[PDB]
Amino acid sequence: AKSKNHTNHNQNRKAHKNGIKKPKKHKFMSRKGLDPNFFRNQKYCLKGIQKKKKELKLKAKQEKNN
Amino acid sequence: KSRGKRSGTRYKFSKKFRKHGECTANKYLEKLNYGDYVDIVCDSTQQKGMPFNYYHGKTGKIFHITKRGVGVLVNKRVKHRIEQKKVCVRIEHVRKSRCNEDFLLRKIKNAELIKEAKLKNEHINIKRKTEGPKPAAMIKVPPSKIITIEPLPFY
Amino acid sequence: IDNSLNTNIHQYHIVGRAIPTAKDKNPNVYRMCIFAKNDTNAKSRFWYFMKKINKLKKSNGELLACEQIKERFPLRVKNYGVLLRYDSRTGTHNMYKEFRDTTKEGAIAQLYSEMAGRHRARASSINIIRISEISSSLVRRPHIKQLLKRRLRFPALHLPTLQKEYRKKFASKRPSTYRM
Amino acid sequence: GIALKNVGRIKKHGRKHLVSKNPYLRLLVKLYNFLARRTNANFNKIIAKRLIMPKRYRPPLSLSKLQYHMANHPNDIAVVVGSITDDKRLFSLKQLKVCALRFTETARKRIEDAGGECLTFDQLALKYPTGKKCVLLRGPTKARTAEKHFGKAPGKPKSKARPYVRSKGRKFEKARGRRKSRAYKK
Amino acid sequence: AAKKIKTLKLINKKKRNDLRQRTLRYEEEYESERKKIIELKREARKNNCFYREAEKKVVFVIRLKGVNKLPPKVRSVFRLLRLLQVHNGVFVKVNKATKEMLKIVEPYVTYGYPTLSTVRKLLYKRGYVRVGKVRRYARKKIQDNADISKHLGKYNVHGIEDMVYQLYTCGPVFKKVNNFLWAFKLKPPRKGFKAKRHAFNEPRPGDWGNREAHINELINRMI
Amino acid sequence: KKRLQNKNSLTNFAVRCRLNPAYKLLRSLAVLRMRKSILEKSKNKKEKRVQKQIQKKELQKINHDYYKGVAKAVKKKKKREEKKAK
Amino acid sequence: AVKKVGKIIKKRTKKFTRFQSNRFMRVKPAWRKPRGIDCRVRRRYKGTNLMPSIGYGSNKKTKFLLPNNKYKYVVKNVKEMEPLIMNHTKYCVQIAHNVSSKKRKQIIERAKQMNVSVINAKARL
RNA sequence: AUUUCACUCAUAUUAAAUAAAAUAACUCCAAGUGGGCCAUUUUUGGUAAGCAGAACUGGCGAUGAGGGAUGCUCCUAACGC
RNA sequence: CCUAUUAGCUGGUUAUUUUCGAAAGAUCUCUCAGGAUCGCUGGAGUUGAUUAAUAUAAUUUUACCAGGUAGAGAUAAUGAU
RNA sequence: AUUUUAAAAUUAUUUGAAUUUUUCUUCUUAUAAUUUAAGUUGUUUCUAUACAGUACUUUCUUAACCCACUCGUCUUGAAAC
Description:
This is part of a larger assembly, with seven protein chains of seven kinds.
Chain A: H1 11-17, H2 39-65
Chain B: E1 37-40, E2 58-65, E3 69-78, E4 81-90, E5 94-96, H1 101-119, E6 137-140, E7 147-148
Chain E: H1 3-46, E1 49-52, E2 58-63, H2 72-81, E3 88-93, H3 96-103, E4 109-112, H4 115-126, E5 128-129, E6 140-141, H5 146-152, H6 160-168, H7 175-180, E7 184-185, E8 209-212, H8 215-222
Parallel strand pairs in E: 4-8
Antiparallel strand pairs in E: 2-3, 2-4, 3-7, 5-6
Chain E binds three RNA strands through helix 1, helix 2, helix 3 and helix 7.
C-alpha cells in the first residue's frame, strides 16, 4: 500500500539525546599526503637534530661512566 | 531526484550587482599560513577549486597549503555529531578570516597594559566587561526642550 | 478604606529620553501622563507610546522620572472631558466622552467600564488622549448636564443591599421594595 | 516534576564490587579498601581500584618490560596488579624488587636467582603502607587479540581491524573489497 | 594536648567579632545609601533637573510554568538559570548576557527587584546551601555559619549577613554566593496568581514578565 | 551529623543571634528607640513639619508647571485641529 | 489506610488482589502485574485495583516484628531454642506445623522456663 | 618548519556571562524499532475533506492526575506511600 | 511414508519487586506486510572528574562572517500590462 | 560510649568599656545554672483493680458518599457495531 515517503520528525531530538558530538581535535595530524618535498625535508631536519642530540648524550654518558 | 554538485546555487553562486569579473590582482598577494583561520567564499568567476555548496560562508583552519590551493578543516553537522571535513579549494575562493582579529588586538593591548601594570605593581582586571546596568546620572536639562507627548488621534 | 470599592487605576507622570549618542549629544526629553494599574504598567505604556510616536525604543532609551500624581482634592466632585481613540472590530474611531467624579483615575476607570460595556472595547484597544477637567458651562453630554441643576434631588428606588449576615434565607413576611 | 538529567541521580560507570569469589583476593581487597580510606594515598586508592578490575585489565607484564621500566630506579620496588611472566628474549636479569598478584614459576625462579625478590600485596601493605619508593606499573591492556577486531569495522576505509575468518589463505576474504582488481579495495 | 580546642575556640570568637563588625558596617551602608538617594532626589527636585537612578543590578526570578511542552531553547535557558521546578526562584545578576537569556524565557517566568528585606527573609527562612564535595552537594538548610565559612571563607564571606549583603548589592563575591545557594523552593502564592497565561504588563490581569519592585509582595506571599 | 529540626532562623531568638551576631544589638536599639515617650514627639511634630514649607513650595511649583505644560499641549493640539478644520 | 499501633506503622492493609479475579474463577486473587496493552490497572485508571509499589514498604526499624514487638522464630526442636536463650526479649517462638504433641509439650516447657513467649501455645491440646 | 635554551602572558574570581557542567569521554556485546498519528506556526496538490504530501517544535503513541459535561493529542500538570 | 516439509503471514507465548528505557528517520535491497545497516536503548568495562575548574553547553554576550525568504518595485533589468 | 559538644540565648553574681542614656542598651572578665540551644515533654484520668464481653484487635457480610466500560491482541487509534 501507499507508505509515508519521508520525514525528519524526531530526528533532531534523536540527535540531541546523545548530544551533538564534537570532533576529538587531536594535537597532531598525519602528514601522509601533505606537502611532499617539505615534510621529507622535515624528516631530514628531525634526523639531524636527533643525531646531534644523541651523539652529545653518548659523549656525556661515556665520559661520565669512564 | 536532482542532486548535482551545484544544485540550488542559483543565487549563492552568482556575482553581486555591478560586482562581476575576475578577482583583483591584489587577492593573489594575501598571505596564508598553516593553522590560521580562513573563510570559504566561493568566487563563481573561478571554476576550478570551487568549494561545494555547503561550505560557502564557513570558516576553518588551514591544514594544507599548495602552490595555488589550500586545504581547510571545516566542521560539518551530520545528524547526531559534528565531523571534520578537509575541503580543498583554490586561493580565489578563500579569504583571511577576521573571526579572531578582535582576539589578537585584545592580546597585544592586554599585553602592553599588563606590562606597565606589573611595573607599577597595580592589580588590574583584564577580562572583558560585558557592561550592564548604568550608574545613576544627575542630569541637567533646561525646560525649553521637555516636550509633552500625547497619543495621536486617528485620521 | 473600602478595598471592595477602590479601583486599581492611578495616574503617573513619566519622563524619558533617548540615550545620548555621537549623532546628538542631548536628545529632547519626552514627558507623559499615563493611567495604569501600577508604575511598571505605566512605564510599559510610556515606552510603547515612545516607540509608536517617536522612533525611540526602550532598548535605546532611559527613564528620567516616574512619579504618581495624586489628586489635589480627592473629595471634590468635578466634571472631566476625556478624548479617546479606540479601534473596533472593523475600524478605528476617536470619540469624546464625559464623566464626573472626584479623581481623574476614577473617571478613567468609569471610562474603561463604559467602553467595555457599550462597545466591547478591551483596554488593549483603548488609547487615552487628553483627559481634562471641564467647567459646568462647557459640559456637552446631557446625562451630565442633568447632574448640574441648582438643587438636585431624587428618590432612592434602589433595592436594599444588606450584609451577608442579615441576608437570611427564610423570611417571616414578604419585604417591601417601597421602604422609603 | 523537575527537569533534571537522569531524573537527578548521579550515574557512575565501571566496577563497583569484586566479582571474583576468591577468599584471598577478597581479603586483599578489604585490606586495600581500608588502606585507601584511612590514608590519603592515591597509591592505595589506585591499587584498590585495580584489584577489582577484570582479567583483561590486569594483563601480564613480562620480565623484560619490568626491568626496562625499573631501569632508572634501581632502589625502588615495582608494583604490578597483574602477573609477571618470564621473557626468554631477555638474556640477563638484575636485582628486581617486585610486588605482584602472581608470578609464573619461571619468572619467580629467575628473579630469585638474580637476587631480587617477589612480594605479595599483603607484604607490600605491611612494608610500604603509603607506597614510598613504589612504582605502579601495568602491562599492555590493549595488546590482546580481541582488541585487534575492535574499532572501525573491517571494511571501513583505512580500517586496521582484523576480520573474523575461519582461515587466512588466498581464498578467504581476499578478493572483492580488499584489492583494486575486484571492485574496490578496503 | 588540649591546645587545639583552645585555639579553635579563639579562632571562632575572632570570626564572630569580625562578622559582627562587618554586619554593623553593612547596616550603616544600607542606611547611608537610602538617605543619599532621598536627599539626591530632593536636590534634583529643588533644581530644574531629572535624577535617574541606577538599575538594581540584581533580579529575582520565579519560574511559573511546569516542565512539559517547552521549546529546547527555553529548557536550556532554564537549566542555565537553575530554574527546574514550577515554583523555583533564583537570583540573577543583571547584564547584557543574562538579560538576553531572560528575554527568551520571559513568558514562563516573573522577576523583579528583591529589596533588602525580602532578600533577608528569603535567605533566613528559605535559604538552603550546597554543602558537600564538588558535584556532590547535598542541600542543607543554613542553621549555622559553619558551612558558609567553610566554603566561602576564602572570599571572607563567613556569615548569612555577608551573603545577604553580597546578594542585595551585587558585590564582588556574587557568583560564588549565588552558586553556593541552592535554588529557592517557593510555596504557591497565598492569595493566588492573576493569570500565568498573560503578561504583568498587559492591561488584563497577568503575571509573567518583569514585575520590577512588585516582585516583593509576590515573594512575600510565596515564602 | 544527624539531621534535627530546622529551627526558624527568624523567630527563634537563640539561633537568630547565632546566625547574626549583630542582631541582638540591632534589635535592642530598635526596641529602645521605640520606647521613646510620646511627649517629645507631641511637642516636636510642629517644629519638624514647619521646616518643610520650602519643600512644599517647590513641590507645588513642579506639579503646577507640569500641569501647565499639559494644558499648553492640549491648547496647541486644539488650535491645530481648528486650523485643520478650515 | 495506615494503621498505627505504638511504634508500628502498617502503611496499608487489605492486601492487593489480582485484577479481574473478582469475576473470574480461573483467575486467582494472588497478585500478578497486569502486562496487557490497554489494561486500565496497568495504566493506573482511577478507581480500579491499584498496584503494589515500593512506596508501601514498612519502616525497616519495625519491619518484620509481630504485634508483640518481637520477631518470630519457627522451631521444630527443643535444640533450636539455644539461640533464643540470648534473645528472649526480642524473639517470640512459633512451633512448626508438623511437630507432634510430645515434642510440642517439651518445646512449650523449655520456652516457658526460658521465659520466651510462644505464638501457637495451645495447639493440639 | 622543527628542536634546545632564555624572559613572561589575569589565575589571590578564574584571558566575556551563566551553568544539580565529569550524570563526562571512550570501548565492547546486544535488544526492540524501521506501518505512525496529532496540535501551533509555515507550506504543496485539491472545490474541499476527520483528504493526500512536506518543514520546526511540542505532544499522543508509551501516560496516568485536575479541568474542558463527554473525548488517545486542548489547558494546568506529568505519577513511591 | 518422505514429514514435526516450507511459511517475509495469523494466533499464542506461564512468578514478584526495583532500576534504565525506545523507534515508527535514513541507506541499500526482485524492495514496499520483509531484511541488512545507521540512528535511538540497555548491560558491561576502562579512562577521567571528584580540586564550585577544566573538559563541556539545543543559552546568551563581544568580534567577525555568509544568505536573497518575508517585504518592496514595476520609471532598475527580464517577462507581463 | 569520647561534638545534644562547642558556642547562642536567658537568669543570678562579677570585671572593664562603650553608648543610641538604660527595669529586654550593647560589647567581655570570670563563676554557677537554665533553654529560647542540642527534632515533646509533664500531669490527671480511663482501659482497670479483666483474663475475652456489649469493650479492644482482626476477618467477613452488608450498606452509604465519591469513583469505576471487557480482558487478551493487531493497531496511530479498542469499551467498541
